[PDB]
Write a protein that binds this DNA or RNA. Structure first.
Ligand SMILES: Nc1ncnc2c1ncn2[C@@H]1O[C@H](COP(=O)(O)OP(=O)(O)OP(O)(O)=S)[C@@H](O)[C@H]1O
Ligand SMILES: Nc1ncnc2c1ncn2[C@@H]1O[C@H](COP(=O)(O)OP(=O)(O)OP(O)(O)=S)[C@@H](O)[C@H]1O
Ligand SMILES: Nc1ncnc2c1ncn2[C@@H]1O[C@H](COP(=O)(O)OP(=O)(O)OP(O)(O)=S)[C@@H](O)[C@H]1O
Ligand SMILES: [Mg+2]
Ligand SMILES: [Mg+2]
Ligand SMILES: [Mg+2]
Lengths: 257, 257, 257, 257
DNA sequence: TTTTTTTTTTTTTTTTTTTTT
DNA sequence: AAAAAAAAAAAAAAAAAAAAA
């Protein structure tokens, strides 16, 4: 069924190139070469996690020799109230090693051992705020002992957590401020969105002012909302037998927010 | 004894089709297809929980194959000050899997494993206000890692809890409002009520204005009160040897509120 | 005495054909042909062990020459904290060989000799959890060295044991999820039960709703409870000089659970 | 019967040339010439044991002289909790000598006599982790006294055992890490597998993306799972009278994992 | 400025058995 | 007939990061 094939596609996710994503990638590349600690802070739904995923794919692990694959970048997202056994477990699994039964001290060395050999140029710890304060000692140890940069990406609240510990605050001072869209950048993003993200049989012309003012009021510059508003409107429109998104559909969806 | 058979019936509960229930079911069906996460908020005794139960029965689990049943929808109601071990336990038991002794970090993974295979297209959490703030991290993780929609049903107080966390508030921005009954919808509901819920030997004619003004003052548009006023009046009337509800009985019951 | 003859019969056990048993039987038949090693997991009192017994009798020993019997399938149930000398002893006795005095290293080899010669295409080890972890090495060796598939039937707790050893977990990934009864399948099972298991002089009509709601509340879908509730009720009823089971008897028995 | 002839074939096993197997053979060849003890560690079902078997067959025993058969490479797999009498017995039997009744101190010396004479350049001990710690002394003695290199092939758990003894850890420091398949290597392996391992009359075109995404999700890069999924699907397909594997069959089998 | 509420994270110990020699 | 080794678990508080009037 054509309709179901398009809905199964639309409900899915993809990465769209944006000025903000390229900016982060070039910035992280500098910190990687210099091995310097830094921070990534911005508002929710601005597309910070997605840009980090894209970076991991930009430079993939290289395995041209018999030895363990050389993984230049490690990306992890700690669970809630993450303790020191959990941080080490997740780093080790990411690099494809199995963790054996033992205590924190027992595989701490193993984490170091697995960290060595593989390149591990940079460690990106998304959602840094969700971590027990005691674990920031093991993060500093890694950053200090090994030639590894620790990006530590987080939301605005993270700064409230970082400032509670002098030694952490004075080691992660450099920061990039991820932001939201406004002005022409938003209009160009909507034009990009229609053509690449949407494969609808008939064009919706979402760049038009009459509907762009609606997308602007509904979105407020958050790339996460633009994705929801247009992705749901496309499925709701096709489900009615339409070949494009009607102004009435954009209004009907916007009213739910 | 005929009288006791009718009292044993009247003291029981049933689901009556209403415009508000159909409206929610069609709305949830859209969010299910789009895998969109959104809240359901309204006043107490408006019949929010009952509409959610009716939805679960609309799409029942399928057992055609010898494989584990594909449950399209999961409905749970967390206990007071629900923590992260309790949320996972209740989801797992709802899928007929028994939980073994272990830590959150052990059956957090089992939950994901039971979540995979079973369809679990949508997760409805009633009494969303009854969650420790720390648990909203495990809810976001589920909503993010897998394509599952989370309803997060709650009362007006839920909004006061949601706005305390930026990341949670942004994710659940879309909402549906239950409301209450007023005008013709109430009169038609009373007519439906006497016909479908009350089966007294002789008709009471509750639609009549002389008694409808009483039901209106006593219920103030809450389907929960209309249920109580008429269900108690029917038992109290039969217990006196009456075949119908007298105006005097409706007045006597209303005076207690 | 007629009464004692019926009680001596009722207190006994028998195998009733069910949809779950046939499903189980023909799934095992696929694994047997493919020589695949797979696990089978189910809740207590769902009739997992009985279905395995029925399978053994479906595929009986065949003797076409003076050579040892061509035993197609082996079924064993290990004792508590079963060690490697005990697993080998029980396999060997099952095939009707006497075990001589010696060490594990002596009749480990004798076990291989008698696993050979006879076909022994399948080995079903019920209650797999009750086994010392060290013995899973001898089970893998059999499964690896000989063209034999091993079932590993067990309860939910078995999965907690299996996941403690990487090499066992990976080998035994395929699974069948034995379940409980609900809906029409339960009503039809009660009709079958009264139809075949119970031969009372006068019919009880256990499929009627007034008593079926009682059997449902008392049974909760477990075939083991339906068997207890009706088997005890039949003996208790006959002992009172009744020719059928009265609603009062089903209620009296249900109250004990 | 054609169908049974194909099933009797499909249920069997064979060795498929792979990049990982050639890599190990060239690596072991270097250690053999240098007489250097070394390790082989990787995950379960990655095809570690099969590559070792292929190596033994690459360099078969040569018997062109008066002296006893010269086996350059010896391959053994110790039983569970293998002690020092068992290690010596299995080495001696492999070289085709009968072991007489006596003590460890008697055929410890007989083992040395038969290790000598025959070239015995390399000893490959599979499943090294399942060995008694006391036996590693007899392994070091062989490696130290005789010009013989010992491989010590095993899983991730072996490293936890090795690090418990300083003298063993230092001796076996060199290692080759086995890796699972990902990317193009997996797609090319599926194409190769269909051509050489499957002799089905009608081509299945398993390289196609629609079914390759299914094989990828079901396999997760483990050559052991790709073998199982496709080998069972071929038997299940032929048993239905099909000349090829249908997408429906690959899905039906994948659902069991 | 107070008063719980709980959570994991910890080892130390004490016995019991199943074979080798 | 006298020894060595490998389990295989139930204890009994306890210092403390975090939280609610
Ligand atoms: N470059 C992009 N291309 C396509 N979609 C994007 C992009 N960036 C963000 N999104 C959308 O944003 C949604 C949420 O992902 P992110 O915005 O990356 O999450 P986030 O930035 O971590 O915000 P949080 O939840 O506060 S941490 C996804 O559903 C994406 O569709
Ligand atoms: N298909 C069946 N036919 C007849 N009796 C059955 C059947 N299934 C279960 N029973 C009854 O259940 C008892 C046997 O236990 P099972 O029902 O097999 O429980 P189980 O599945 O073995 O669960 P456990 O406790 O884990 S062994 C006997 O008393 C049988 O009479
Ligand atoms: N060259 C090959 N040709 C055909 N089948 C192969 C080949 N290599 C591996 N396999 C299959 O994939 C599985 C994995 O190989 P194994 O011999 O199990 O190595 P392994 O998984 O490292 O051993 P374990 O599980 O750690 S004891 C085997 O059971 C084979 O069926
Ligand atoms: Mg995020
Ligand atoms: Mg049983
Ligand atoms: Mg192997």
């Amino acid at each position: 069924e054509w309709l179901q094939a398009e809905i199964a596609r639309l409900k899915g996710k993809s990465i769209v190139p944006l000025q903000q994503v390229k900016t982060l990638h070039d910035w992280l590349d500098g910190k990687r070469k210099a091995r310097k600690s830094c921070r990534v802070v911005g508002e929710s739904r601005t597309g910070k996690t997605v840009a980090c995923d894209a970076y991991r794919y930009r430079h993939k692990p290289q395995q041209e020799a018999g030895r363990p694959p050389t993984v230049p970048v490690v990306y992890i997202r700690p669970h809630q109230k993450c303790g020191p056994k959990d941080l080490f477990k997740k780093i080790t699994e990411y690099l494809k090693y199995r963790v054996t039964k033992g205590t924190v001290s027992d595989f701490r060395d193993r984490t170091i051992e697995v960290l060595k050999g593989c390149g591990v140029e940079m460690l990106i710890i998304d959602e840094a705020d969700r971590l027990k304060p005691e674990t920031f000692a093991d993060v500093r140890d890694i950053a200090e002992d090994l030639g590894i940069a620790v990006v530590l990406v987080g939301t605005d609240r993270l700064d409230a957590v970082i400032k509670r510990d002098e030694q952490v605050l004075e080691r992660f001072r450099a920061h990039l401020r991820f932001g939201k869209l406004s002005g022409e950048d938003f209009k160009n993003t909507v034009e990009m969105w229609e053509q690449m993200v949407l494969k609808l049989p008939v064009s919706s012309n979402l760049k038009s002012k009459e509907m762009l003012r609606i997308l602007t009021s509904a979105t407020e510059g958050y790339i996460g909302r633009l994705d929801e508003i247009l992705r749901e409107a496309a499925i709701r429109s096709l489900s009615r037998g339409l070949k494009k998104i009607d102004k009435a559909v954009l209004q009907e969806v916007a009213k739910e927010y």
